[PDB]
C-alpha cells in the first residue's frame, strides 16, 4: 500500500533467488519479487543480501527486477466460500484463473483473490446477543453455503478479545463485508465473516482431549488390521502407481467424517481432472438432501509440472484448512498425495541453498516438519462459547523409491505415526483387490479402536487376533509347504491353509468396481468375520472328532459357497438373511454328524 | 530298507531342489540389494565428504583474496 | 553483443560486464575459430553471469570469443509445415531441405495444463495388441510408458505399435504421431527410420533426431522441441497428437552428467534431486483440454539398466508417469513374440474405456479374471518347479496350462500382425474356456454363461 | 544488548561489531511481534558473534528485534518445590500453576564427578518383571540403555517399569521429553496418573508441537535436576530421556547448520563427548546416600541397531535393552531379545546376600539355552520339521516355553526374583540335569525340588 519497501534482485539460480539491499524483509515472509510481482518466501540471509525461495516459476525473470516485501508471513483466508472450490498453490481459484486468463495453460505473476468477493451468502447471527463479551474463536454468525453442510461458522479473528459493540442485523452479505463491530482495549476493530489466519501457525483450540470416537473406514482390512480413529494419524506408504491415488480417492469417498481436504502434491493432472469430473457424479444418499461429494469436500492442486515449493505450500495450506475445519467443531480429514514429492522438494531446496544433505538428499529438518504435521492434527475441543469437540485426521501418501521402507520418508513417517497402512505391489500386479501386508502393517490405536468397537458390543479384538494368529500360522504353513510339501502337513494345518485361502478370497478380496463389495458396512464385516470364526471353530471341532479334512471339505461345499456369496448381499434391509446363514453352518455340522 | 532309501532319496532330491532355485536365489537377491544399499550409502557419504572438502576449499579461496 | 569473458572450467562458461540476464535465455556464442554455438543461460549474479555451452568449451579462446545475448528465453520456431519434414536435435533440418518458415516462435519448455482446464482421459483406441487392449487398456490422450531391456526387441515392438496404431484405431480422421530420439544408436536410428518409412506415417508425422554423437544438451533439448511441437499440434492445429519418445535412459545419464559437472547436490543413485520434477515436466504435459478438440497421448519408451526393474530410472518413471508397460527379458529369450509381462505392466485408468456404451461390459471382469488365472498360474508354476509336477493340485496344472497357452497364443501374435479388439476379446473368451467353471472367481454368472460356448 | 545483526542462516543467527561476547551464554531476545525468546551463543569470532535460537528464528525482523545478553552462561533455578509440578520446554509451568520459589541457581550443564569421589553401586533394585530382574539385573546407580523401533510400544514398557520400580526410601523419577509426540505425552500422563506416583515425580515437557531445538536444553535441565537431587536432597533419582533419537537429529541439525565436518548419519564430530555428557547424568558419589541413574530411551532408525546412535549408546553405556519387532508382532507381552540384551551390573548384584547364589548360574544357563534354541530354530528353518534329532528339539521346546512364559510376564504383573527363580526352575525341568554345561556342581544340586 505505497509503503515501497523494496530490495533488488542479486543472484538467481533455478527456483532460488537471492535479493540484496533489503534489511526489512523477515524470514519465511511473503514478498512480491520480479517484474510480474510473483509471490515468494525469504529463507536465509547473508549480510545485506537475503536468500529468498520462490514458490513459483523463475523463468523469464532478469537481474534488476524489483522485489517488494509485504512484511507479513504466509497467510490464508478462513471462512465460508472455500467449500467446493479448487485453489492453486497461491490458494487462488483455478476455474476463475482459467476463465480470467482465457487459457488452458498456467500463467506467471498473476494475482487473484482466494474466495469470491462478489459471492453473496445468507448469514444469521448464531445465538449471540449484542453487548455480550466475546473473544477469539467465538462464532459471530452462521451462513449456509450448501444444502448439506449448513451454518458455516464465522470465527472471531485471532488476537482479539473484548465486548460486542455494534453488531449489524442478520441477512445477505459477503466475505469482504464486516458483519460485526467489537469494542475492546484495542479501541475499534471491524469484524467480518471471513477471517485471515497464518498458514505457518495451525488453528488453535481449547485443550487436547482423548478420542474415544472411532472413524469408519469403510474397508474391511482398514477397519480390522490397522485401525484409524478420528484425530488419528494413519500413514499410507506405497510404490509408484500402486493405487495410492485410488486408495486416497476411495478414502475421500467412503469417509464417514464431515468434510474432506484433498491436496494433490506433484501428482498427475489426469488424477485431479478425473476427480473433478467424477466429483459431481457422486452424491450423498444420507441426510441433507441433494448434495454431491464436490460440495462436501475441498481440493488443493499442486501439479507435477508445477513448482516444487508449490507442493509444500499446498500441503501447509491444506493443513491450515483442515485446522480451520477442525476449529469448526466437526470431524474432518486431510488427504495428501505423494508427500515424498514435497520431501524431495525440500531436498532440492536445502540442496540449492548450499546446505549439506543428510539422507536421500533431504535435509535434517524433514523429521521435525513431519512430526509437526503429525502432531498438528487430532481430536480436541475448539475455541468459542459453543465448546464443540472438533477432530482432524491426517492421511498422507508416501511414494518411496522401489517400495523400500529404508527410504527417509517412510522412516520419518512411521516414527511420528501411531498407525501405518502399507501398500503392496504383489497383489496390485495380479489385479487383485487392495494390497496390504498383514505381516507388516500395524496400528498402536487398535486397543482404543477395539474399546470403541465394543460400543456396539461386537468383538473386534477376539476376531482380529484369531484371524491374525491364523494368518501367521498360515504363513508358517506356507513356508513349510514351500520347504517340504503339502503332503507333509497335518489335517489342522491343511484346514488352516483352506481357511487362509477362504479368508483371502472371500474377505480380504473385494472388488472396488462392484456395486456391492466396493463398500462393506460395520455390521456386515462383523457378521462375516463371526461366520468365518464360527465355521473355523466348527471345522476344528469336526476335525477333532476323528474326521478327515477332505471328507469334511466334501460336504462343506454348500456352506463354503454360501460364505463366498456373502460379498454381494444387499442394502441395509435384509441383513438378517445373512445372520441366518450362520445357522445353516450349525445345521451343516449336524449334517456332518450323520 | 530299499523303500526307506527311496523315500530318503526323495527327501534329498527335495532338499536339493530347495537349495537350487529357493535358497540360492534368495541369498543372491539379498546380497545384491545389500550391496546396492551399502554402495549407495558409501556414495552418499563420499558425496557429503566431497561437499565438505569443496566448502573448505571455497572458504580458503575466499580467505586467500 | 558482449565480447568479454572471464573464466573457463570444464564444459561451461562464465562472462562479465553484462546485466539483466534471463533464466534459460537464448544466447549465441561466436568462438575464435568462427564456430557459432547456441547456448542457454544458467544463472546470473550481480554484474557477472554463468551459462552452459552446448557444443562444449573445447578449443575456444577466452579473449578472442564474442557472445550475443538475445535476452529472450528459450525459443523454438514451431510451424504447421513441420509435418512430413524431419528435424535434428538442434532444430536444424535433417531432411536436407530448405529454410523452414516458422508460423510461431514459442518456448520449448511447455506450459503445464491447468487442473480446472484439464480434462480426464476418455474414449478408447485400438493398438492392435491384445495385451494393449484386454490386460491393460490404453486410453486416447492418456499417458503410459514402456519399460524394456537392452538387447530386447524394444525397437521392433515400438515399430509394431506405431505401425498398427492408426491402422487398428480406424476400426473403433487418421491418427498423427511424433517420433523423437535423444542420444540413440545409429543402427536404432536406421531401424526407426525404416520403421516410419514402412508405416508410411512419416508424411503425417514429424521427427526429432538427436544422435549419440551429438552433444547431450541438444539431446535433452530435443524432448522440449518435441513437446512444444506436440502441444502446438494438439492446441493450435487442433489435431490428435501421439507422442513417441525413445532412449530416455541416455538423456537421464546425460542429465546426471550435467548435474555432476556443475557439482550440484545429487539425489538417489547419483542422479539429480529435481529429476522427478524434470521428468514430470513433460510427463504432466499430456492430457485433454476442456473445450479444445484433440488430445496428447504420451507413449514413452525407456530401457531399464542391466534389466533391473528395481532401477531408479524405472522407479522415477513410474513415480512420474501413470501406469507403464513392462517388457521382461525372461520371455524375450523364449523365442515367442514380444515379451510383455502382464503382472508388472498396468494402466492408470483401465475402467475409463471399459463398461457398456464404449465397447462391452464383459471387458474388465474378463481382464481381472485372466490376470487372476495368469498370476495363479505363475505361482503354481513356481510351486510345480519347486516341489514337483505330482505335488500340485488340478487347479495348479490347469492354471499352468492356461497361462502357457496365454503366453503362446494370446501373448504371441506378430509385429506386422495387428489383432482387432474383437479378435482379442474372442481369443480371451476362448482362453477362459480352457480354465474350469469354478476356476475364475472374478467373473460374473451372466458373462460366464454368455462367453462359454 | 545489541539491536544490530549481520546475517541469518536458518535457525542460526550471526551479528557483527559485537563486544564483550560470552561463549555458551544465555540470551533473551525480543522480536518485532513483541514475542520474547531464549537462545544460546554457539561461537564468537573477533568483533562478530554467532548465536543459535532454541525456539527458532522464524518470524523475526532483523531491524525491530533486540538481543539482550546477560554476559554469563545458562543458569537454571533449581528448587525443591518442583515436586509434583510440571514445566514446559522454556521452563514455564505447564501445570497451570504459579511460579515456584527457587532454592538455588546454577548451570544446567551440571558438573563432572571426581574420579576418586565416585562410588560403584552394589545396590539391587527389583524390576518386578520376570524377564527383567532375572536376565539383565536392574541396579540403582547403573546405566541401562533402551533402544526401540518405529511403531513399537516402548513407552508402555517404560511406564510399566517406572510403575513397578517404587528400602524405606522411595525412588524419585525425572523425565525429559525431546520432540515427544502429543499422543506419547497423553499416554505417559495417563500411565503416570494411573500409577499415582505423579506427586513424587516431575518433568519438563517439550512436545512435537513445541520447538525441538529447545528440547536439548530440557534434557540438560532434567540432568541438573537429578544432580541437584543427588548432591543435595540425598535421595534415589532415576532420569529418563524419551525420543533421544530426535535429540540426536536435532544436534545433527545444529551441526549441519554450522557447516562443520559431519560424521556418520550426519552426526557431529564432538558428539562422542556430547553423548557421553548425556550418559554422565548417572552415577553416585562418596558420602551421598542418594543415587542418580539415567535411563535414556531412543528409537533405532529403520529398526537397525547398527545405526550410529544405537552404536554409540551401546558402546558408551554399560549394557543395552533391545526390542525385537517379531516377538512384538507375535502378540505376546514385551519383546526383549536376550541375545542383544546384556547387563554389566549383573555381576556384583548377583550371588548370595543380594538375590540368590543360583542367580548367575541360571542366568548363564538361560542365555545358553536361548542361544542353543536360536541355532536350533535356524536349523529347523534350514532342515526339516524333525527339529534336528534330540538336543535341538528339547532346545527349541525350552526356547518356545521360555518365550511364552519367562519372556512374557505381563504388563500389569509384578513378580519377585524368587518367583522368577522358581518359574525358571520349573522351565528348566524339561531339559536334562546333565544337559546344562553352564551350571556348576552346586548349582545343579541347588534346586532338585
Swiss-Prot record, chain A:
One of its GO terms (cellular component) is Golgi membrane. It is found in: Vacuole membrane. Its EC number is 7.1.2.2, 3.1.-.-. It is a peripheral membrane protein. The keyword Nuclease applies. The modification Phosphoserine is found at residues 385, 455. GO terms for molecular function: ATP binding; DNA binding; endonuclease activity; mRNA binding; proton-transporting ATPase activity, rotational mechanism. InterPro entries: ATP-synt_VA_C, ATP-synth_a_Xtn, ATP_synth_asu-like_sf, ATPase_a/bsu_AS, ATPase_F1/V1/A1_a/bsu_N, ATPase_F1/V1/A1_a/bsu_N_sf, ATPase_F1/V1/A1_a/bsu_nucl-bd, ATPase_F1/V1_b/a_C. V-ATPase is a heteromultimeric enzyme composed of a peripheral catalytic V1 complex (components A to H) attached to an integral membrane V0 proton pore complex (components: a, c, c', c'', d, e, f and VOA1). Interacts with RAV1 and RAV2 components of the RAVE complex, which are essential for the stability and assembly of V-ATPase. Present with 199895 molecules/cell in log phase SD medium. Catalytic subunit of the V1 complex of vacuolar(H+)-ATPase (V-ATPase), a multisubunit enzyme composed of a peripheral complex (V1) that hydrolyzes ATP and a membrane integral complex (V0) that translocates protons. V-ATPase is responsible for acidifying and maintaining the pH of intracellular compartments. PI-SceI is an endonuclease that can cleave at a site present in a VMA1 allele that lacks the derived endonuclease segment of the open reading frame; cleavage at this site only occurs during meiosis and initiates 'homing', a genetic event that converts a VMA1 allele lacking VDE into one that contains it. This is V-type proton ATPase catalytic subunit A. It comes from Saccharomyces cerevisiae (strain ATCC 204508 / S288c) (Baker's yeast).
From Swiss-Prot, chain B:
It is found in: Vacuole membrane. Transmembrane segments: none annotated. It comes from the Eukaryota. Subunit of the V1 complex of vacuolar(H+)-ATPase (V-ATPase), a multisubunit enzyme composed of a peripheral complex (V1) that hydrolyzes ATP and a membrane integral complex (V0) that translocates protons. V-ATPase is responsible for acidifying and maintaining the pH of intracellular compartments. Belongs to the V-ATPase D subunit family. V-ATPase is a heteromultimeric enzyme composed of a peripheral catalytic V1 complex (components A to H) attached to an integral membrane V0 proton pore complex (components: a, c, c', c'', d, e, f and VOA1). Interacts with RAV1 and RAV2 components of the RAVE complex, which are essential for the stability and assembly of V-ATPase. Present with 8500 molecules/cell in log phase SD medium. This is V-type proton ATPase subunit D. The chain holds residues 155 to 219 of 256 of the full protein.
Curated annotation (Swiss-Prot), chain D:
Gene3D superfamilies: 3.40.50.12240. The keyword Magnesium does not apply. Pfam families: ATP-synt_ab, ATP-synt_ab_N, ATP-synt_VA_C. It is found in: Vacuole membrane. The keyword Phosphoprotein applies. The modification Phosphoserine is found at residue 111. GO terms for cellular component: cytoplasm; cytoplasmic stress granule; fungal-type vacuole membrane; Golgi membrane; membrane raft; proton-transporting V-type ATPase complex; vacuolar proton-transporting V-type ATPase complex; vacuolar proton-transporting V-type ATPase, V1 domain. It is a peripheral membrane protein. One of its GO terms (biological process) is ATP metabolic process. Transmembrane segments: none annotated. Coiled coil: none annotated. Keywords: ATP-binding, Hydrogen ion transport, Ion transport, Isopeptide bond, Membrane, Nucleotide-binding, Phosphoprotein, Transport, Ubl conjugation, Vacuole. Its main location: membrane. GO terms for molecular function: ATP binding; proton-transporting ATPase activity, rotational mechanism. ATP binds at residue 344. Non-catalytic subunit of the V1 complex of vacuolar(H+)-ATPase (V-ATPase), a multisubunit enzyme composed of a peripheral complex (V1) that hydrolyzes ATP and a membrane integral complex (V0) that translocates protons. V-ATPase is responsible for acidifying and maintaining the pH of intracellular compartments. V-ATPase is a heteromultimeric enzyme composed of a peripheral catalytic V1 complex (components A to H) attached to an integral membrane V0 proton pore complex (components: a, c, c', c'', d, e, f and VOA1). Interacts with RAV1 and RAV2 components of the RAVE complex, which are essential for the stability and assembly of V-ATPase. Present with 131000 molecules/cell in log phase SD medium. Belongs to the ATPase alpha/beta chains family. This is V-type proton ATPase subunit B.
Amino acid at each position: 500500500h505505497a509503503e515501497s519497501e523494496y530490495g533488488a534482485i542479486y543472484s538467481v539460480s533455478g527456483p532460488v533467488v537471492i535479493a540484496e539491499n533489503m534489511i526489512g524483509c523477515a524470514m519465511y515472509e511473503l514478498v512480491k519479487v520480479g517484474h510480474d510481482n510473483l509471490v515468494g518466501e525469504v529463507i536465509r540471509i547473508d549480510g545485506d543480501k537475503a536468500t529468498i525461495q520462490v514458490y513459483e516459476e523463475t523463468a523469464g525473470l532478469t537481474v534488476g527486477d524489483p522485489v517488494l516485501r509485504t512484511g507479513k508471513p504466509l497467510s490464508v483466508e478462513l471462512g465460508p466460500g472455500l467449500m467446493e472450490t479448487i485453489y492453486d498453490g497461491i490458494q487462488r481459484p483455478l476455474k476463475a484463473i482459467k476463465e480470467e486468463s482465457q487459457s488452458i495453460y498456467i500463467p506467471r505473476g498473476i494475482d487473484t483473490p482466494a474466495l469470491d468477493r462478489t459471492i453473496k451468502w445468507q448469514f444469521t447471527p448464531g445465538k449471540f446477543q449484542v453487548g455480550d463479551h466475546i473473544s477469539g474463536g467465538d462464532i459471530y454468525g452462521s451462513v449456509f453455503e450448501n444444502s448439506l453442510i449448513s451454518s458455516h461458522k464465522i470465527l472471531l479473528p485471532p488476537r482479539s478479545r473484548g465486548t460486542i459493540t455494534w453488531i449489524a442485523p442478520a441477512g445477505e452479505y459477503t466475505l469482504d463485508e464486516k458483519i460485526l463491530e467489537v469494542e475492546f482495549d484495542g479501541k475499534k476493530s471491524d469484524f467480518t465473516l471471513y477471517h485471515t489466519w497464518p498458514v505457518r501457525v495451525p488453528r488453535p483450540v481449547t485443550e487436547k482431549l482423548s478420542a474415544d470416537y472411532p472413524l469408519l473406514t469403510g474397508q474391511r482390512v482398514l477397519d480390522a488390521l490397522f485401525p484409524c480413529v478420528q484425530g488419528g494419524t494413519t500413514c499410507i506408504p506405497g510404490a509408484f502407481g500402486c493405487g495410492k491415488t485410488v486408495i486416497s480417492q476411495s478414502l475421500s469417498k467412503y469417509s464417514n467424517s464431515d468434510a474432506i481436504i484433498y491436496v494433490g502434491c506433484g501428482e498427475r493432472g489426469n488424477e485431479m481432472a478425473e476427480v473433478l469430473m467424477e466429483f459431481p457424479e457422486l452424491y450423498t444418499e444420507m441426510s441433507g438432501t441433494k448434495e454431491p461429494i464436490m460440495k462436501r469436500t475441498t481440493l488443493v492442486a499442486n501439479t507435477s509440472n508445477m513448482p516444487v515449493a508449490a507442493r509444500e505450500a499446498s500441503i501447509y495450506t491444506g493443513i491450515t484448512l483442515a485446522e480451520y475445519f477442525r476449529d469448526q467443531g466437526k470431524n474432518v480429514s486431510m488427504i495428501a498425495d505423494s508427500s515424498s514429492r514435497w520431501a524431495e522438494a525440500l531436498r532440492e531446496i536445502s540442496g540449492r541453498l548450499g546446505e549439506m544433505p543428510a539422507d536421500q538428499g533431504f535435509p535434517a529438518y524433514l523429521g521435525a516438519k513431519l512430526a509437526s504435521f503429525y502432531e498438528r492434527a487430532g481430536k480436541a475441543v475448539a475455541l468459542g462459547s459453543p465448546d464443540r469437540t472438533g477432530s482432524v485426521s491426517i492421511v498422507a501418501a508416501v511414494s518411496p523409491a522401489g517400495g523400500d521402507f529404508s527410504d527417509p520418508v517412510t522412516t520419518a513417517t512411521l516414527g511420528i505415526t501411531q498407525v501405518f497402512w502399507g501398500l503392496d505391489k504383489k497383489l496390485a500386479q495380479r489385479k487383485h483387490f487392495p494390497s496390504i501386508n498383514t505381516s507388516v502393517s500395524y496400528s498402536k490405536y487398535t486397543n482404543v479402536l477395539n474399546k470403541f468397537y465394543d460400543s456396539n458390543y461386537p468383538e473386534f479384538p477376539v476376531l482380529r487376533d484369531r484371524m491374525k494368529e491364523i494368518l501367521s500360522n498360515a504363513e508358517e504353513l506356507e513356508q513349510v509347504v514351500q520347504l517340504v510339501g503339502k503332503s507333509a502337513l497335518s489335517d489342522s494345518d491343511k484346514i488352516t491353509l483352506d481357511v487362509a485361502t477362504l479368508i483371502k478370497e472371500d474377505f480380504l478380496q473385494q472388488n472396488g468396481y462392484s456395486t456391492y463389495d466396493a463398500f462393506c458396512p460395520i455390521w456386515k464385516t462383523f457378521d462375516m468375520m463371526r461366520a468365518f470364526i464360527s465355521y473355523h471353530d466348527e471345522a476344528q471341532k469336526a476335525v477333532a472328532n476323528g474326521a478327515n479334512w477332505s471328507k469334511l471339505a466334501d460336504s462343506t461345499g454348500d456352506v463354503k459357497h454360501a460364505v463366498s456369496s456373502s460379498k454381494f448381499f444387499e442394502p441395509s434391509r435384509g441383513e438378517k438373511e445373512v445372520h441366518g446363514e450362520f445357522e445353516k453352518l450349525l445345521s451343516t455340522m449336524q449334517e456332518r454328524f450323520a | 530298507a530299499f523303500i526307506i532309501l527311496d523315500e530318503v532319496i526323495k527327501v534329498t532330491n527335495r532338499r536339493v531342489n530347495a537349495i537350487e532355485h529357493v535358497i540360492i536365489p534368495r541369498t543372491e537377491n539379498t546380497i545384491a540389494y545389500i550391496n546396492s544399499e551399502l554402495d549407495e550409502l558409501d556414495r552418499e557419504e563420499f558425496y557429503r565428504l566431497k561437499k565438505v572438502q569443496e566448502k573448505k576449499q571455497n572458504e580458503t579461496a575466499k580467505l586467500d583474496a | 553483443n558482449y565480447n568479454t569473458v572471464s573464466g573457463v572450467n570444464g564444459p561451461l562458461v562464465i562472462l562479465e560486464k553484462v546485466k539483466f540476464p534471463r533464466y534459460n535465455e537464448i544466447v549465441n556464442l561466436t568462438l575464435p575459430d568462427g564456430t557459432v554455438r547456441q547456448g542457454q543461460v544458467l544463472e546470473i549474479r550481480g554484474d557477472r553471469a554463468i551459462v552452459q555451452v552446448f557444443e562444449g568449451t573445447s578449443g575456444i579462446d577466452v579473449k578472442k570469443t564474442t557472445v550475443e545475448f538475445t535476452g529472450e528465453s528459450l525459443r523454438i520456431p514451431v510451424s504447421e509445415d513441420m509435418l512430413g519434414r524431419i528435424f535434428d536435435g538442434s532444430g536444424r533440418p535433417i531432411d536436407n531441405g530448405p529454410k523452414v518458415f516458422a508460423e510461431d516462435y514459442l518456448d520449448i519448455n511447455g506450459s503445464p495444463i491447468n487442473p480446472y482446464a484439464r480434462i480426464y482421459p476418455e474414449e478408447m483406441i485400438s493398438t492392435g495388441v491384445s495385451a494393449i487392449d484386454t490386460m491393460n487398456s490404453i486410453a486416447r490422450g492418456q499417458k503410459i510408458p514402456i519399460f524394456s531391456a537392452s538387447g530386447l526387441p524394444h525397437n521392433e515392438i515400438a515399430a509394431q505399435i506405431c505401425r498398427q496404431a492408426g491402422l487398428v484405431r480406424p476400426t473403433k480422421e487418421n491418427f498423427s504421431i511424433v517420433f523423437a530420439a535423444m542420444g540413440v544408436n545409429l543402427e536404432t536410428a536406421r531401424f526407426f527410420k525404416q520403421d516410419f518409412e514402412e508405416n508410411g506415417s512419416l508424411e503425417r508425422t514429424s521427427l526429432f533426431l538427436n544422435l549419440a554423437n551429438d552433444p547431450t544438451i541438444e539431446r535433452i533439448i530435443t524432448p522440449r522441441l518435441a513437446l512444444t511441437t506436440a502441444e502446438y499440434l494438439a492446441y493450435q492445429t487442433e489435431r490428435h497428437v501421439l507422442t513417441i519418445l525413445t532412449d530416455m535412459s541416455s538423456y537421464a545419464d546425460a542429465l546426471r552428467e550435467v548435474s555432476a559437472a556443475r557439482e550440484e547436490v545429487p539425489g538417489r543413485r547419483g542422479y539429480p534431486g529435481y529429476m522427478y520434477t524434470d521428468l514430470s515436466t513433460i510427463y504432466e504435459r499430456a492430457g485433454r483440454v476442456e473445450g479444445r478438440n484433440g488430445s496428447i497421448t504420451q507413449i514413452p519408451i525407456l530401457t531399464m539398466p542391466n534389466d533391473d526393474i528395481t532401477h531408479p530410472i524405472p522407479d522415477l518413471t513410474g513415480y512420474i508417469t501413470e501406469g507403464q508397460i513392462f517388457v521382461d527379458r525372461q520371455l524375450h529369450n523364449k523365442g515367442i513374440y514380444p515379451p510383455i509381462n502382464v503382472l508388472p505392466s498396468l494402466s492408470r485408468l483401465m475402467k475409463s474405456a471399459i463398461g457398456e456404451g464404449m465397447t462391452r461390459k464383459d471387458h474388465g471382469d474378463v481382464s481381472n479374471q485372466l490376470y487372476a488365472k495368469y498370476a495363479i498360474g505363475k505361482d503354481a508354476a513356481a510351486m510345480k518347479a519347486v516341489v514337483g509336477e505330482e505335488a500340485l493340485s488340478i487347479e495348479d496344472k490347469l492354471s499352468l496350462e492356461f497361462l502357457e497357452k496365454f503366453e503362446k497364443t494370446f501373448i504371441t501374435q506378430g509385429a506386422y500382425e495387428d489383432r482387432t479388439v474383437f479378435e482379442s476379446l474372442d481369443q480371451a473368451w476362448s482362453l477362459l474356456r480352457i480354465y474350469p467353471k469354478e476356476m475364475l472367481n472374478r467373473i460374473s454368472p451372466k458373462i460366464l454363461d454368455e462367453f462359454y460356448d
